């Protein structure tokens, strides 16, 4: 029952993983154990040149899976089925790409949104919370799916802000307006 | 080698892929053996595609093949039989009986594949060769240790000329010969076998002065290419390890081009430069070096070529034109005139020609013959509209000569009594050189043109003159 | 990165937790795509090569390309009943045809089922759709004549049994007519004595609609050239696997007579449309092609098919299946890829010219671009002898006639040649769909070569022909009989022939 | 069954739906996209899998929101057929383009159908007369016959089809069907009016002429299945009822042409120099659904637009295979002011190649062809040098040929502005008599200009008399 399936190649592998684990529960557990093992493998230096960059055979991949099931508690056997699908397809490099997308699908089914309030500088804790109150109030969320907005620093923007999520964006960046000011005053 | 387990993954025409296990993988140009109800199926490895997974070309047919069937490694390429017990006998691509006189008689075996002789080895010189035909001996620069090339169309009497050449060179030749037929018909197989039972070149008991490798055109395209290579390695054993002369003979080599072009597309490449193989340069080259006259021995090829639609500006015929030393071109027009062989001597070329190369007498005679015939070809258009009568008495004489010379290149052969009808006639290198000189000086420029119809030597023309008189 | 559709994450995870390999992806496999009257299914990890897989839609399609991703199955049907999520069950049997003397006077499609309601095929064996060419040991030289209504073609171009000669030309140039002359003269041997003079002719029609072919067979039933022949069809509206399979299953029906020591002859019309079917077939299964978009292994198909017609040893009865390919060149395009391949296979040409059709030589006759690579001795020895200077007059004639059209003159002897070459040209003409036995093809060619058509004028060729055949019918009908049965002329026979020609040398 | 789904992709004009249901319909079924500007009727062509099909779109494809409801109606698009569809114009969806309210109908039949079998179809030829001499001589038309035109369009095409409608289809007692697949709508308007005036359409009621027009301003998929629509109507009259018909098409190239465009979009590789690899298959199926059955017998005339006037082009080439008579028509021949615009050295028929039209007739064509070929073969020597540098014999033949060449010029009865001149018409028997005489030199002695743009033998004489005063 995909809550919002992704077409893109491996946004479909995320879709597949979700449905299977959603009808047998334990998705929040699965994803949590998965994120932990992915972080502890990459920061281990053996597979920091070999699962970070796939460069292993077919037979050498299966033996990687066997060392991996020590590393965490599997927690749901559909994520153990993902390890068999990727070892067979002869990469381990787009392993975390499926995981990241699966995570979004998982938090979306629960009813949680993750967005961004990109700025060139951080604002007041007041500023962030008002913007949240306004978005829930406004007729763009029914108040049915929960809210997360994440402030980030991007270097693109020169001042002002853009709130982004769901392909709804409210744009009051100055960066663009400055550029157009120059053009029109060199006309 | 020991047992190697591979499983078939895909049957796609000839193309068959395998899934070998890690740390026990074949290498490019091996021969794989598969137990099948089709005997032993052999796959020639031609690529690896990565991940312990190969891509092969078949060498035996792919009918009723079951995916997941176990695939062996011989440990190396197909090894055919080479010997001096391979004289007469008929041999296929995998070195497996098609003359059905039991397994093919060997002393040694070698793989189909081998290395082109090295430059240090080379002892290659060109020394006058002959076949017993007048147009060939005088007006074509054949040399021994050369690489003769019988360029021509389809059905211009290709089979006749080839029949006549083996008929002559082999019986006279102290050595043997090796005949390879690459992608030619089952009509042709019995006919080549049949013609040479009759002339006595093939004897079931003793040795033979010719060998046979008949590879046919219903055979899978990968297998089609290595009929040429199979035959080639026998020529090498003759040259090398016996230290005998042999004269290699191939039929048609266009079929060799064609065969690479097919398995090229399927391997995943594009056959570029008009639907012919890209890898033409390196495969052609392999063949050419391999046929040589070294300090070990002499192997001289006479190679059949088919030019599609008499087009010499298609890239496939043209590259080959450079690589065959002593080219000849056969045309349809000469056959219809009743002129035999189909050879036009105004189209034969060797890369370098002088008075030292072919010799002083030979040069001068062969140049004079060509200019009289070349002036006639030029004047033909002019004469069509203006008429002979607007040109000179002299012009008329260069024309009247070119015609008498022109029918002096007719020679019916004994194995073209099934084709033409007229008895056998042969003229040696000596007889042609001495006699053509007389004609140009004007001693026989009073004998009728039709008294040069169907003649051998000078003698026949006089005898045929008497026949028109009476 | 992208991986094959059987390795896709939804299909693969369920298999691990239910069924995967063995009788579901091994004897069975589950369809996953379909369109263009072509499907591809996942599974079939064990399957024969060229095997027939029956889809659970009441469609059967053979598989020629196998992939561990998607096995590409060519349907013999429409896709408007074939679906995604159907199972396919293996027949376990490679594509096969009924062979018998109970395919005679009957129309059959490439699955050997009646398509004209003449009911059941009484079959004495079944045989194989793909069968390798005979070797070096089962082979005999060809020396057997074949009668054709056009005298110049039979005499110069030797029409044997166990040999392949290519009739080539454009549409409506009597591509069809040359073959039909052959078939028609075979009423006479069919009726007649001697088993080894008998062709059970097999007619193959590929990419020719239902309406055109059905008119044709009715024509052969008039002339009593259908009641022993076999008609194989693969119409244009029927699927491309079916157009491709028609020549290769027709082959088996001729191959059974060959086997038993009888003889047959196979017309492969249209070899060009098989090649078109094959192009569709390989490019929707994804095979990189060569020039003109026709695949790489198009030649391999064409070489193997043609080589199912050859002559055998006396162990297999002295039998021959004989082939005559038929090729429809675009515009006289003989430098195209598919015509260059066919050409290679075939050791003679039955060249037709378009301009000559128009000139009144219907059906068109061109023996100056005809070739014979092999020796000539598989025709009536007699027709060859009479027609012995026929080559020399027709080939010399072409040069003097070319020259004459530039307004440059020549001596009286060349105009004797030229004049004779015109008298001869008229002889050839005779309307399509007409027989002309060999027995009356030896007189006329004697008559032409000895200047007995040179006693008459350019339009009195037809009036001479009428009297000479009448004269031979009264006096020299014994002469006619010896020519057919024994086929050899002596001084005695040639002297009688001479009396006959002199008698009506004028008119 | 209604299958709710969403439109995932608007990949060109071959839109793709992804249903949110685990069911799927069979290929060649119908789907309706629920858009606020009407509907689109689309037909499934591929299953790609996971519940995402690709459907060919027969209705305009701008303004499609990705994420918009689709419904499964099930099965082919249904046209209207009967005695009440007579005089009507039909688009591709059963909809009229001349209005007057809807098409009145009894039966609505699927546009995707099976073609009648081999036992049920045999070709015929029973000899119709064309008032056009050049056709009679070179490639005589007949009932059951399959006629084909080639070379360019707008060179005189339209004029020629109308001449055929004028003589044979106003003396045909069955219905007659005009189907112009993606025809140029101006010409269409002209044709509708003139037919209704000359009485062969009357109101929406009973008629001897019915019409179907494709609009060529519609998307590629719609153009493809105009051809399919028009065949459905013909099937009904010919087959169910069992009444005789006729059929005229300008151009069927359009059908093939549409296919090559959609080929790229569907998932196929398009066959080289811009065609489809499913070229043979589609072409056979369309010409097998209208050819002579046993339930009726229908003479079809097909016109093929050639983008170079060369038949080496594969689309014209596989058409030429499915005809019994041809009359290749060429642009060069038009510009030379020869109307009829038909080639004389490129027209042939399989009833005239074996004397099934008679000995006197066959004999009359044979000579005519030989003279005319002499003229073209010696045409270089003819322009570069004159006729007193050629043999007298040669000069005579060439002289006769030129006169024959002019004689084939005749204006159509329907032309009055396409030739300038009001036409002249002759019979089949009249055409034969006329030529016969001409070969015997009876009227080779009076101007060439006397043979140009006139009718019968009598008319030639009469214009020579004009020219002497």
Q: How many beta-carbon pairs under 8 angstroms link B with C?
A: 171
- Does residue D187 have an active-site annotation? no
Question: In sequence order, which residues have a C-beta less than 8 Å from that of residue D379 and are 6 or more positions away?
Answer: none
Question: In sequence order, which residues have a C-beta less than 8 Å from that of residue C233 and are 6 or more positions away?
Answer: C107, C108, C109, C115, C205, C208, C210, C213, C246, D118
CA separation for the pair C42, C155 (Å, rounded): 58
Cβ–Cβ below 8 Å for B159 and C374: yes
- Does residue B55 have an active-site annotation? no
CA separation for the pair C93, B46 (Å, rounded): 31
Match 């008495």 to its residue by tokens. Answer: B393
Active-site residue, from B158, B209, B255, B425: B158
Query: How many other C-beta atoms lie within 10 A of the C-beta of residue A124?
Result: 8
- Does residue B107 have an active-site annotation? no
CA torsion C325-C329-C332-C337 (nearest 10°) is: -90
- Tell me if C417 is assigned to a ligand binding site: no
Cβ–Cβ below 8 Å for A78 and C14: no
Cβ–Cβ below 8 Å for C335 and B309: yes
Element (H, E) at B382: helix B360-385
Q: Report chain C's C-alpha Rg in angstroms.
A: 27
Pull the structure tokens for residue C151.
């005298």
Pull the structure tokens for residue B419.
């084709």
Cβ–Cβ below 8 Å for C139 and B157: no
Q: Which chains touch C (3 or more CB pairs under 8 A)?
A: A, B, D
CB contacts of D287 in chain C (<8 Å) are 209, 236
Element (H, E) at C270: none
Going by DSSP bridges, is the β-strand pair D210-213/B176-181 parallel, antiparallel, or unpaired?
Answer: unpaired
The CATH number, out of the four listed (2.40.160.10, 3.40.50.300, 2.60.40.420, 3.40.50.2000), of the domain defined by the range C94-379: 3.40.50.300
Q: Which of D4, D273, D329 is nearest to D138 (CA)?
A: D329
DSSP string computed for B424-444: P----HHHHHHHHHHHHHTSS
Cβ–Cβ below 8 Å for B21 and A59: yes
Match 């309307």 to its residue by tokens. Answer: C431
Domain D77-351 has CATH 3.40.462.20: no
CA separation for the pair C102, B183 (Å, rounded): 37
Which of B99, B263, B266 has its CB closest to that of C287?
Answer: B266
Architecture (CATH level 2) of domain B353-470: Orthogonal Bundle (1.10)
Q: Can the peptide bond before residue B321 be classed as cis, meaning omega within 30 degrees of 0?
A: no
CATH number of B2-77: 2.40.10.170
Which of B9, B100, B154 has its CB closest to that of C68?
Answer: B9
Task: Assign 3-class secondary structure to B282-305.
Answer: HHHHHHHHHCCEECCCEECEEEEE
- Tell me if C174 is assigned to a ligand binding site: yes
Helix runs in B173-220, H state only: 186-198
| φ, ψ for residue D241, nearest 5 deg | -65, -45
- Structural resolution in Å: 7.5
Question: In sequence order, which residues have a C-beta less than 8 Å from that of residue C504 and are 6 or more positions away?
Answer: C464, C467, C468, C471
DSSP SS3 for C266: strand
DSSP SS3 for C127: strand
Same fold, C21-93 and C380-507: no
Angle between helix D428-439 and helix D392-407 axes, rounded to 10 deg: 160
Angle at B387 between CA B386 and CA B389, to 5 degrees: 115
Q: Where are the domains of chain B?
A: 2-77, 78-352, 353-470
Active-site residue, from C287, C308, C373, C484: C373
Residue among C107, C109, C209, C403 with most chain D CBs within 10 A, to mutate: C209
Q: Are B243 and B297 in contact (CB under 8 A)?
A: yes
Going by DSSP bridges, is the β-strand pair D146-149/D298-303 parallel, antiparallel, or unpaired?
Answer: parallel
Active-site residue, from D133, D157, D225, D254: D157
If you measure CA to CA, which chain B residue comes closest to C378? Answer: B418
The torsion region of residue C386 among left (phi > 0), alpha (psi -120 to 50) and beta comes to: alpha
Class of domain D1-76: mainly beta
Match 């080599």 to its residue by tokens. Answer: B253
Pull the structure tokens for residue C287.
């095979």
Going by DSSP bridges, is the β-strand pair D342-349/D325-329 parallel, antiparallel, or unpaired?
Answer: antiparallel
Cβ–Cβ below 8 Å for C16 and A17: no
CA distance to B176, C186, C216, C296, D337, per residue, from B85 (Å): 12, 49, 58, 38, 79
Q: How many beta-carbon pairs under 8 angstroms link C with D?
A: 185
Q: Are A97 and A129 in contact (CB under 8 A)?
A: no
CA separation for the pair D401, D373 (Å, rounded): 9
CATH number of B78-352: 3.40.50.300
Q: Are C131 and C255 in contact (CB under 8 A)?
A: yes
Question: In sequence order, which residues have a C-beta less than 8 Å from that of residue D26 and are 6 or more positions away?
Answer: C80, C81, C82, C83, D44
DSSP SS3 for C442: helix
DSSP SS3 for B219: coil
Q: Bridge partners of B21?
A: B24
Q: Which of B194, B266, B224, B288 is nearest to B46 (CA)?
A: B266
Pull the structure tokens for residue D101.
């309210």
CA separation for the pair B303, B228 (Å, rounded): 11
CA separation for the pair C453, C445 (Å, rounded): 10
Q: Are A57 and B22 in contact (CB under 8 A)?
A: yes
CA separation for the pair C88, C62 (Å, rounded): 11
If you measure CA to CA, which chain C residue comes closest to A87? Answer: C7
CA separation for the pair B218, B231 (Å, rounded): 18
Q: Bridge partners of B12?
A: B15, C65
Domain C21-93 has CATH 3.10.20.30: no
Cβ–Cβ below 8 Å for C9 and A98: yes
CA torsion D33-D34-D39-D44 (nearest 10°) is: 10
CB contacts of C67 in chain B (<8 Å) are 9-10, 12
B334 touches chain C (CB under 8 A): no
Fold (topology level) of C380-507:
1.20.150
Q: Which of B201, B225, B200 is nearest to B215 (CA)?
A: B225
Angle between helix B186-198 and helix B158-172 axes, rounded to 10 deg: 40
Active-site residue, from D183, D204, D235, D261: D183
Cβ–Cβ below 8 Å for D281 and C239: yes
Element (H, E) at B36: strand B31-36
CA separation for the pair B248, C32 (Å, rounded): 55
| φ, ψ for residue C153, nearest 5 deg | -70, -45
- Give how far the C-alpha of residue B160 lies from the chain's centroid of Cα atoms, to the nearest Å: 13
The CATH number, out of the four listed (2.30.29.30, 3.40.50.720, 1.10.3210.10, 1.10.520.20), of the domain defined by the range A11-110: 1.10.520.20
CA distance to C260, C446, C467, C485, D302, per residue, from C501 (Å): 44, 9, 10, 22, 53
The CATH number, out of the four listed (1.10.1140.10, 1.20.210.10, 3.40.50.2300, 3.30.1340.10), of the domain defined by the range D352-469: 1.10.1140.10
Q: Are D347 and D328 in contact (CB under 8 A)?
A: yes
CA separation for the pair B161, B132 (Å, rounded): 12
DSSP SS3 for D39: strand
Q: How many CA atoms lie within 13 A of C211 on its CB side?
A: 28
The secondary structure of residue C265, as a DSSP letter, is E
Which of C172, C213, C286 has its CB closest to that of D350?
Answer: C172
């Amino acid at each position: 029952p995909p809550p919002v399936r992704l077409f893109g190649v491996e946004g479909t592998y995320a879709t597949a993983l979700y449905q299977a684990a959603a009808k047998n529960s334990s998705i929040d557990a699965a994803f949590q154990s998965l994120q932990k093992v992915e972080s502890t493998v990459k920061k281990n230096p053996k597979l920091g040149h070999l699962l970070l960059n796939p460069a292993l055979s077919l037979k050498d991949r299966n033996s990687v899976i066997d060392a991996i099931v020590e590393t965490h508690k599997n927690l749901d056997g559909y994520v153990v089925n993902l390890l068999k699908v990727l070892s067979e397809n002869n990469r381990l490099g787009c392993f975390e790409k499926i995981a990241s997308d699966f995570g979004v699908l998982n938090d979306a089914h629960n009813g949680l949104l993750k967005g961004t309030v990109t700025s060139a500088e951080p604002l007041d804790p007041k500023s962030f919370k008002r913007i949240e109150k306004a978005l829930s109030a406004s007729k763009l969320v029914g108040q049915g799916k929960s809210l997360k907005l994440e402030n980030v620093v991007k270097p693109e923007i020169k001042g002002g802000l853009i709130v982004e999520l769901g392909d709804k964006t409210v744009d009051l960046s100055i960066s663009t307006k400055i550029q157009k000011l120059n053009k029109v005053l060199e006309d | 080698s020991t047992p190697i387990t591979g499983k078939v993954t895909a049957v796609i025409g000839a193309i068959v892929d395998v899934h070998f296990e890690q740390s026990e993988l074949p290498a490019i140009l091996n021969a794989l053996e598969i137990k099948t109800p089709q005997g032993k199926l052999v796959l020639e490895v031609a690529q690896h595609l990565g991940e312990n997974t190969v891509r092969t070309i078949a060498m035996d047919g792919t009918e009723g093949l079951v995916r997941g069937e176990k695939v062996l490694d011989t440990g190396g390429p197909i090894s055919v039989p080479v010997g001096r017990e391979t004289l007469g006998r008929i041999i296929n691509v995998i070195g497996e009986p098609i003359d059905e006189r039991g397994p093919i008689k060997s002393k040694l075996r070698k793989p189909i594949h081998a290395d082109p002789p090295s430059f240090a080895e080379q002892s290659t010189s060109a020394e006058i060769l002959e076949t017993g035909i007048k147009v060939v001996d005088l007006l074509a620069p054949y040399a021994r240790g050369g690489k003769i090339g019988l360029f021509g169309g389809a059905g211009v009497g290709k089979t006749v000329f080839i029949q006549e050449l083996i008929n002559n060179i082999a019986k006279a030749h102290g050595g043997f010969s090796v005949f390879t037929g690459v992608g030619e018909r089952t009509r042709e197989g019995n006919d080549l076998y049949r013609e040479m039972k009759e002339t006595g070149v093939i004897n079931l008991e003793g040795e033979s002065k010719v060998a046979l490798v008949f590879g046919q055109m219903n055979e899978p395209p990968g297998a089609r290419a290595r009929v040429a290579l199979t035959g080639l390695t026998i020529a090498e054993y003759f040259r090398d390890e016996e230290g005998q002369d042999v004269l290699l003979f191939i039929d048609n080599i266009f079929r060799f081009t064609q065969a690479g072009s097919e398995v090229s597309a399927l391997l995943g490449r594009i056959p570029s430069a008009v639907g012919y193989q890209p890898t033409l340069a390196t495969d052609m080259g392999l063949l050419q070096e391999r046929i040589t006259t070294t300090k070990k021995g002499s192997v001289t090829s006479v190679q059949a070529v088919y030019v599609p639609a008499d087009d010499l500006t298609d890239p496939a015929p043209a590259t080959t034109f450079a690589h065959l030393d002593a080219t000849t071109v056969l045309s349809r027009g000469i056959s219809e005139l009743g002129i035999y062989p189909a050879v036009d001597p105004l189209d034969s070329k060797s890369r370098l020609l002088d008075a030292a190369v072919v010799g002083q007498e030979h040069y001068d005679v062969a140049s004079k013959v060509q200019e009289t015939l070349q002036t006639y070809k030029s004047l033909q258009d002019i004469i069509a509209i203006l008429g002979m009568d607007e040109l000179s008495e002299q012009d008329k004489l260069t024309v009247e000569r070119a015609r008498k010379i022109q029918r002096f290149l007719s020679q019916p052969f004994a194995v073209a009594e099934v084709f033409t009808g007229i008895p056998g006639k042969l003229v040696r290198l000596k007889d042609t050189v001495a006699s053509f000189k007389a004609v140009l000086e004007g001693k026989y420029d009073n004998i009728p043109e039709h008294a040069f119809y169907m003649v051998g030597g000078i003698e026949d023309v006089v005898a045929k003159a008497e026949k028109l008189a009476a | 990165t992208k991986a094959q559709p059987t390795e896709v994450s939804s299909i693969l995870e369920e298999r691990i937790k239910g069924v995967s390999d063995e009788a579901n992806l091994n004897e069975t496999g589950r369809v996953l795509a379909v369109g263009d009257g072509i499907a591809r299914v996942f599974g079939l990890n064990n399957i024969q090569a060229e095997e027939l897989v029956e889809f659970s839609s009441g469609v059967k399609g053979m598989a020629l390309n196998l992939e561990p991703g998607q096995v590409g199955i060519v349907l013999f049907g429409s896709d408007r009943l074939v679906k995604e999520g159907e199972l396919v069950k293996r027949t376990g049997n490679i594509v096969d045809v009924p062979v018998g003397p109970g395919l005679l006077g009957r129309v059959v499609d490439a699955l050997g089922n009646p398509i004209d309601g003449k009911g059941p095929i009484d079959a004495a064996g079944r045989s194989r759709a793909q069968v390798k060419a005979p070797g070096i040991l089962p082979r005999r030289s060809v020396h057997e004549p074949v009668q054709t209504g056009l005298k110049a073609v039979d005499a110069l171009v030797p029409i044997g049994r166990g040999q392949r000669e290519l009739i080539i030309g454009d549409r409506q140039t009597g591509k069809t007519a040359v073959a039909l002359d052959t078939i028609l003269n075979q009423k006479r041997w069919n009726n007649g004595s001697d088993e080894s003079k008998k062709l059970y002719c097999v007619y193959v029609a590929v990419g020719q609609k239902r309406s055109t072919v059905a008119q044709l067979v009715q024509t052969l039933e008039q002339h009593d050239a259908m009641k022993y022949s076999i008609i194989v069809a693969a119409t244009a509206s029927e699927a491309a696997p079916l157009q491709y399979l028609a020549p290769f299953t027709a082959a088996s029906i001729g191959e059974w007579f060959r086997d038993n020591g009888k003889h047959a002859l196979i017309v492969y019309d249209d070899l060009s449309k098989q090649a078109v079917a094959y192009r569709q077939l390989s490019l929707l299964l994804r095979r990189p092609p060569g020039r003109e978009a026709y695949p790489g292994d198009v030649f391999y198909l064409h070489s193997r098919l043609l080589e199912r017609a050859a002559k055998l040893s006396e162990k297999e009865g002295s039998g021959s299946l004989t082939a005559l390919p038929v090729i429809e060149t675009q515009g006289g395009d003989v430098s195209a890829y598919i015509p260059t391949n066919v050409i290679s296979i075939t050791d003679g040409q039955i060249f037709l010219e378009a301009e000559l059709f128009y000139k009144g030589i219907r059906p068109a006759i061109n023996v100056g671009l005809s070739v014979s690579r092999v020796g000539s001795a598989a025709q009536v020895k007699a027709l060859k002898q009479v027609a012995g200077s026929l080559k020399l007059f027709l080939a010399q004639y072409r040069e003097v006639a070319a020259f004459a059209q530039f307004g440059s003159d020549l001596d009286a002897s060349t105009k004797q040649t030229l004049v004779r070459g015109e008298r001869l040209t008229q002889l050839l003409k005779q309307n399509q769909y007409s027989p002309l036995a060999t027995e009356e093809q030896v007189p006329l060619i004697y008559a032409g070569v000895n200047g007995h058509l040179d006693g008459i004028e350019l339009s009195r060729i037809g009036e001479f022909e009428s009297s000479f055949l009448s004269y031979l019918k009264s006096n020299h009908n014994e002469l006619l009989t010896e020519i057919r049965e024994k086929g050899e002329l002596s001084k005695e026979l040639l002297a009688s022939l001479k009396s006959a020609t002199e008698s009506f040398v004028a008119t």
